[PDB]
TrEMBL record:
The record marks 274 as: May be important for catalysis. It comes from Bacteroides thetaiotaomicron (strain ATCC 29148 / DSM 2079 / JCM 5827 / CCUG 10774 / NCTC 10582 / VPI-5482 / E50). GO terms for biological process: fucose metabolic process; glycoside catabolic process. Alpha-L-fucosidase is responsible for hydrolyzing the alpha-1,6-linked fucose joined to the reducing-end N-acetylglucosamine of the carbohydrate moieties of glycoproteins. This is alpha-L-fucosidase.
């Protein structure tokens, strides 16, 4: 046991209703919108293959020149009600929005910097319009916030002098003032998801990360705070020096989800994965031919994968500079929503089932002991193997969409073959099991 002042304070999952709602939501969308949407990955004739929201860095653009993109910020097609309607039809229960990315441009009219939506041709409080519209559709709103800020000359990557230390203190005050402003201007916010906290400067200031968590929890009752914010006394991030999770949930698994056989430890804590549609573009990039672009079934597979291991999934969108979405993202949201309208009972408010993983797909467990078989890989055998834990039996199988009874055959003393449906559903599909626990 290493003694810590700024380590974990939660042991185990929060079970207050706000945390139950964050968890039960399960499926979210992410919005990455900022000045990077204007150049869209291209600067002075060169299209850079790196993440569009990092173009300032790829193209070595000075801060003042980058921020002059504000003069072009005029998203005339923006309509927050239409964004909320898109999110509703996708089946999302919450939306996570970039309030300020590394570039430092604020989507709300901050009084602590000039680099905001207020000082653009458009003028309007984009964030505030989104909060109202998503909340009107019954959708929770979460705030992404980058601590690292390329627009503020008090930022430091490391602290190598007294002068650095003084500047960085003033930077942390600024950061607090913005955070307090977000929490008070938009009191319906349900989560802060911090990014840009990896630098040595932040790791040396673990105390500040703990302070930020506490300060926001005091201002917003029941707010969730991600693990990525947090560093302990020794500069250990996400999990402290004693291996305990900091914040309210683990944020991670951006590229790759936990392995369903080897990473069952994640079932012990809340966690949320966030995913891009292309391989690694969060902001709007004009050229999606540069990397692999996931199909709707590949996204759906990741959504159900997360839920099956006790986690949430958030699907990222990078809106165009004009305030509309690209055709690939409209098609994705529509396809997800059509599947979720059919099969969403196996997703919303579901969790890890405690069954051995099988090849056909994933199990999820509902709030009243329903066990759902979500089938992505259809066996040529026409038999879906189900190995039950000790003491558990399968009493019935039903096709979710139609209520058709599905034959269940015992093959050995804890294993069944569940038949595939009489007609191939032609898409990933759900069979609902009724199970019984002995003694
Ligand atoms: C959710 C994603 N997090 C952001 C990011 O900048 N990651 C890059 C990064 C992560 C760790 C060290 C250096 C760079 C991406 O730009 C998205 O906002």
């Amino acid at each position: 046991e290493i003694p810590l002042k700024y380590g974990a304070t939660n042991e185990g999952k929060r079970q207050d209703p706000a945390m139950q709602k964050f968890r039960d939501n399960r499926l979210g969308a992410f919005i990455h919108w900022g000045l990077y949407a204007i150049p869209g990955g291209e600067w002075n004739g060169k299209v850079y293959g790196g993440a569009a929201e990092w173009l300032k860095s790829w193209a070595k653009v000075p801060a003042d020149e980058w921020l002059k993109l504000m003069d072009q910020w005029n998203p005339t097609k923006f309509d927050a009600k239409k964004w909320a309607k898109m999110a509703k039809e996708m089946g999302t229960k919450y939306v996570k929005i970039t309030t300020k990315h590394h570039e430092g441009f604020c989507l709300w009219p901050s009084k602590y910097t000039k680099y905001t939506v207020a000082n653009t041709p458009y003028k309007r409080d984009i964030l505030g319009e989104l909060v109202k519209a998503y909340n009107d559709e019954g959708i929770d709103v979460h705030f992404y916030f980058s601590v690292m800020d390329w627009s503020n000359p008090d930022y430091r990557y490391d602290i190598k002098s007294k002068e650095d230390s003084i500047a960085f203190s003033r930077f942390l005050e600024f950061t607090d003032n913005q955070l307090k402003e977000l929490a008070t201007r938009y009191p319906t916010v349900k989560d802060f998801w911090f990014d840009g906290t990896w630098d040595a400067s932040v790791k040396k200031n673990g105390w500040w990360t703990a302070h930020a968590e506490q300060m926001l929890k005091e201002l917003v009752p029941g707010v969730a705070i991600n693990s990525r914010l947090r560093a302990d006394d020794k500069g250990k991030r996400h999990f402290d020096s004693n291996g305990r999770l900091m914040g309210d949930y683990e944020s991670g698994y951006e590229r790759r989800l936990p392995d369903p056989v080897k990473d069952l430890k994640v079932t012990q804590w809340d966690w949320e994965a966030c995913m891009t549609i292309p391989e690694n573009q969060w902001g709007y990039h004009k050229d999606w031919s540069l990397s692999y672009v996931k199909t709707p079934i590949e996204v759906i597979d990741r959504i159900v994968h997360a839920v099956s291991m006790g986690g949430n999934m958030v699907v990222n969108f990078g809106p165009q500079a004009d305030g509309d979405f690209r055709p690939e993202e409209k098609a994705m949201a529509t396809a997800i929503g059509k599947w979720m309208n059919r099969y969403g009972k196996a997703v919303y408010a579901c969790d890890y089932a405690g069954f051995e993983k099988q090849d056909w797909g994933y199990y999820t467990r509902g709030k009243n002991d329903e066990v759902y078989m979500v089938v992505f890989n259809q066996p040529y055998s026409e038999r879906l193997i189900v190995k039950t834990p000790k003491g558990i039996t399968v009493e019935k199988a039903t096709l979710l969409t139609t209520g058709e009874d599905i034959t269940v055959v015992e093959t050995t003393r804890n294993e069944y073959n569940v038949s595939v449906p009489k007609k191939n559903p032609g898409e990933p599909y759900v069979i609902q099991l009724k199970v019984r626990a002995a003694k």
